[PDB]
Ligand SMILES: *C(=N)[C@H](C[C@@H]1CCNC1=O)NC(=O)[C@@H]1[C@@H]2[C@H](CN1C(=O)[C@@H](NC(=O)C(F)(F)F)C(C)(C)C)C2(C)C
């Protein structure tokens with residue numbers, strides 16, 4: 001029992017982290033097989049951070065302009081290509097620590113772990129969610145770029161995020177491993193701001209189910225709601241509209257607790273009206289929205 | 303910027319986790335050099351659990367009663383012995399993935415990373431504090447025993463915790479890797495309860511510094527308190543007393559933020575006496591106490607391993 005913000009074990013990702021240097025810019029790279037993936041802005045100097053022409057900057061580079069370092073070893077770069085906003089460096093060594101992996105593009109609400117890295121070395125692992133506004137509330141300093149977000153399913157690592165930038169609210173934007181940004185952001189130092197963020201409603205409901213499974217019922221009520229009445233109320237607390245897809249996905253937690261999804265929505269409605277009045281749920285006086293239905297089943301099995 | 307509950311990278315520890323089976327009990331072992339460490343209660347049948355005689359169970363078992371698997375590989379056990387509440391299995395093979403390590407015993411308030419494992423398989427990593435009542439607020443199911451807690455200092459893993467049990471309140475108790483329990487607990491199936499917990503004051507202050515470093519400043523006031531005045535209000539709300547040591551440890555954060563410790567004490571005193579007035583700090587409605595001063599400096603500086 002118990003309920004923790006919990007990250008995947010970082011070892012399979014630690015074995016893939018390299019340092020990538022181009023001129024005087026150093027950030028992190030993900031060495032999978034014989035490719036190093038990293039943010040393409042590694043090829044930027046300070047001036048052209050505003051309107052970089054990445055194709056023009058990249059055509060001016062030779063393979064030998066890229067310092068890739070894995071611990072002591074300099075890897076030999078034998079190819080460079082750009083895919084969207086990631087630079088792919090072909091190297092002369094397959095990484096022998098390469099885990100089973102896939103690249104996956106996630107949707108807002110989805111959770112994942114971040115291995116925060118500096119100079120190709122891991123600082124820490126934490127658990128994130130893709131916010132509705134396509135930002136992540138990360139912990140990233142100078143040189144963090146190329147740090148990745150991942151899930152692990154059995155022994156397969158699904159890379160879903162590569163870190164590129166921090167927005168003015170102290171929140172973070174990045175790409176999938178195909179170099180496509182999450183949300184409307186660009187890898188330019190032009191004026192960009194996160195849209196108004198909303199609460200991941202399906203995730204709050206999952207967490208309320210976890211509270212029940214861990215034996216807390218104080219916030220339940222004898223009410224139900226229509227999906228539509230629920231959304232009309234939730235949206236006034238800047239909650240994401242709950243969809244039928246979201247109701248379906250709460251099915252298993254509903255079955256394990258015996259609390260109908262729309263009954264739990266009724267509870268959430270009242271929680272939004274009343275707050276906690278000094279009470280907590282699972283050690284929080286906020287409603288937690290960075291645990292998916294899948295995270296709750298994984299931690300609350302027995 | 304940003305501030306997250308951050309665990310140490312778990313890779314050096316994942317290379318050491320194995321599955322130990324004795325009879326029908328499977329749990330996790332820590333394989334370092336040619337020894338596999340695990341809770342001694344692995345040898346217990348349902349009967350034994352209730353009033354175990356560990357020494358006696360142990361001596362009546364051949365090495366072959368201990369099934370140790372690192373992935374698809376069976377390790378050969380060539381010896382077994384008890385040290386307090388940990389079983390040590392001598393294996394015929396040094397773990398080629400053994401990191402630089404030591405066994406360390408941590409103090410209440412100190413934080414560490416737990417690598418939750420099942421069937422020798424790392425499932426999750428989370429950052430924990432040793433509560434003042436020597437429990438941890440963990441997340442552990444059946445088969446999680448032998449899951450370990452650690453810190454990393456450079457490339458040295460300091461193992462500080464092995465998971466043994468869950469108390470009725472849904473909190474967790476365990477030993478250092480020398481099998482000494484944290485807290486007044488025993489590895490028997492018997493009614494035990496966590497004593498009353500207190501808040502790790504020095505950690506809350508470090509976390510308020512983390513807030514200030516990330517621009518979360520609303521709870522700052524102009525006032526300064528004293529240790530004595532603060533500690534009189536602190537004890538009353540079941541907050542650990544703050545020592546001159548605690549104050550000295552915050553000096554780097556005090557100097558970085560321009561917020562003196564006894565000012566942050568005044569801010570924390572007001573928060574205890576006033577609550578947060580529908581406000582959050584670093585996305586929490588509650589005062590967080592599972593970040594140490596060293597945790598805040600390391601995360602806010604970008605220290606790597
Ligand atoms: C990678 N090494 C950093 C990660 C940043 C640094 C501070 N915290 C982080 O997460 N990435 C960058 O420096 C990117 C990079 C140029 C500028 N940049 C930014 O993150 C900047 N932000 C923006 O330009 C904004 F607001 F538009 F997102 C900065 C002001 C330095 C935080 C490029 C090419 C975007």
Ligand SMILES: *C(=N)[C@H](C[C@@H]1CCNC1=O)NC(=O)[C@@H]1[C@@H]2[C@H](CN1C(=O)[C@@H](NC(=O)C(F)(F)F)C(C)(C)C)C2(C)C
Pocket residue numbers: 001329343346351442443444445446447448466467468469470474488489490491492493494
């Ligand atoms: C090891 N794999 C489990 C881990 C437990 C199982 C549920 N969550 C956990 O953290 N450890 C045990 O099953 C230990 C073990 C016998 C019984 N036990 C307990 O954790 C039990 N607790 C207690 O008896 C109590 F309350 F005193 F702490 C149990 C009721 C099964 C949770 C021994 C030798 C203590």
